[PDB]
């Protein structure tokens, strides 16, 4: 045993080494030995963790996809369901397309959600309205099939109920709204954090009469936020802002805000540059600029644009793509995020249109499916907008300062150096820059010290970095010598009060006013 081989390795080492290879490689390795074949075709974990990276279910290899998904793979189930619904990759005749495609897509979507662990439900966004005006679109077919399955499922049906309820929530009908609310009630009956929080949000708008119900709501909010939700945490961070009515102490509210403000870590970095052949961040700047323009066209909120940029960054960090596909990535991410959170979405026929038909319907379908499958289903993540909102609902400040804070919060999207700081620190520094720009006597208040859990000395570097990377340096141009000004053009609207054209101070003035030297 001087030279040990792969032949005599134990089950754990073989399990781990075989879980990080693509499907083509795992098929190739299956030709080496009989014991390897027995291990692969006997133990379901190796198939369960196998990739299906850059493949898509064609009629030649439908059996492979079905076999891998049916025994513990999530990517295969997602791709199979999306291919069955969107009808790209499978040669299904138009006469029998509807029923068979709907049932297959619904079954595979249910399996994909069942195999998901530790994420908020997401499969409801592939079937959300608007639907076909005439006839029966496959989205409706899979919707009714999923409803029937939930009526007949036993293992894990709460996620299916939540997805169903989220589907009819976006329907403009009082009956549809009552069926939706009726849905998270049944989902909350079996236990679901997001469903319970949505139920609570549907009750805050209804009954605000006496402090007793406010205390009941505070109890439920504490229960939800303690478990680990995100929307619940953000909502609870403002019910503490309602400190006067709500029975509690100043120290408790300050502690809650400190906990939610010191529980963030910097995530993104130069990983994306070193994980591909090359990006040079100029292509990212171009893509984000174009996405900002498209969001300006169709009245898209700040939150959706931030989510789209974050999803783009996550996918780019996970699965590599060639240069000529970045715009496809951006359009697919905007479609997916707009479907997720917003109300008016970027429809697929429209989605391909802005790209000057450079790509096609099928390519966008494939990119959307693979983007969703590569993110494991986690779409909503901490973003600067949430902390900007929680900080501006605490300290009462003038409207121009609010608009400026929003403007510097949105300018972090283009630049990637601002990822070295957590969203909490960056949002606090943005509020600090908004206050100091208007020349208020006291930038940082004792209330802010007690709430944000940080002092001035914890915020000097972040303000300097934000101001430099936002206004200072120069704009990236190569031939046209014209700066990319979609964000500035987005913020020249009268709805924002023509904020973007007001002057701002220089880096030297900011350093002088903040007591920071230079060299």
């Amino acid at each position: 045993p001087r030279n040990l081989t792969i032949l005599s390795l134990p089950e754990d080492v073989l399990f781990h080494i075989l879980k990080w290879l693509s499907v083509e490689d795992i098929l190739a390795v299956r030709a080496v030995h009989s014991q390897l074949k027995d291990l692969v075709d006997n133990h379901a974990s190796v198939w369960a963790c196998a990739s299906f990276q850059e493949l898509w279910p064609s009629p030649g290899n439908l059996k492979l996809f079905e076999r891998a998904a049916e025994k513990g793979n999530f990517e295969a189930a997602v791709k199979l369901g999306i291919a069955y619904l969107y009808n790209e990759g499978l040669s299904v005749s138009d006469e029998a397309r509807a029923e068979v495609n709907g049932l297959k897509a619904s079954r595979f979507f249910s399996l994909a959600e069942r195999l998901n662990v530790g994420a908020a439900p997401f499969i409801w966004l592939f079937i959300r309205p608007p639907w076909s005006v005439s006839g029966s679109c496959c989205k409706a077919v899979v919707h009714e099939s999923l409803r029937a399955e939930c009526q007949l499922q036993r293992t894990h049906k709460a996620s299916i109920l939540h997805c169903l309820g989220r589907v009819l929530s976006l329907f403009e009908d009082e009956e549809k709204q009552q069926q939706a609310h009726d849905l998270f009630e049944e989902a909350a009956h079996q236990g679901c954090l997001t469903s319970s929080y949505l139920l609570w949000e549907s009750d805050r708008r209804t009954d605000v009469s006496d402090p007793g119900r406010c205390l009941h709501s505070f109890r439920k909010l504490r229960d939800y936020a303690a478990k680990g939700c995100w929307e619940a945490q953000l909502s609870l961070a403002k019910a503490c802002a309602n400190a006067n009515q709500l029975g509690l102490e100043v120290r408790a509210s300050s502690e809650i805000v400190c906990q939610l403000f010191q529980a963030s870590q910097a995530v993104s970095k130069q990983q994306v540059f070193s994980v591909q052949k090359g990006l040079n961040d100029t292509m990212r700047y171009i893509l984000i600029d174009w996405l900002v323009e498209v969001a300006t066209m169709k009245d898209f909120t700040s939150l959706c644009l931030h989510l789209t940029v974050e999803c783009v960054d996550r996918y780019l960090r996970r699965r590599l793509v060639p240069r000529y596909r970045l715009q496809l990535l951006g359009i697919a991410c905007m479609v997916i995020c707009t479907r997720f959170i917003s109300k008016e979405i970027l429809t697929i026929r429209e989605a391909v249109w802005l790209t000057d038909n450079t790509y096609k319907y099928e390519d966008l379908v494939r990119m959307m499916g693979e983007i969703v499958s590569a993110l494991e289903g986690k779409i909503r993540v901490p973003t600067v907008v949430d902390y900007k909102e929680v900080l501006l609902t605490l300290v009462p400040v003038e409207l121009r300062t609010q608009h400026l804070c929003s403007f510097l919060c949105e300018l972090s999207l283009l630049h990637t150096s601002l990822s070295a700081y957590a969203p909490a620190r960056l949002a606090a520094a943005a509020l600090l820059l908004a206050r100091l720009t208007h020349g208020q006597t006291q930038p940082w208040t004792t209330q802010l010290w007690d709430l944000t859990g940080f002092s001035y000395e914890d915020l000097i570097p972040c303000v300097l970095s934000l101001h430099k990377k936002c206004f200072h340096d120069d704009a990236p141009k190569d031939y046209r010598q014209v700066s990319l000004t979609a964000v500035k053009q987005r913020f020249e609207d009268k709805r924002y009060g023509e904020i973007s054209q007001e002057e701002v101070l220089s880096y030297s003035q900011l350093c002088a006013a903040l007591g920071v030297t230079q060299d």
Partner: peptide, 13 residues
């Protein structure tokens, strides 16, 4: 720089 939204972005340096 610039053209309208409908475009094929020029990534090439």
């Amino acid at each position: 720089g610039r053209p309208p939204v409908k475009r094929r972005l020029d990534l090439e340096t």
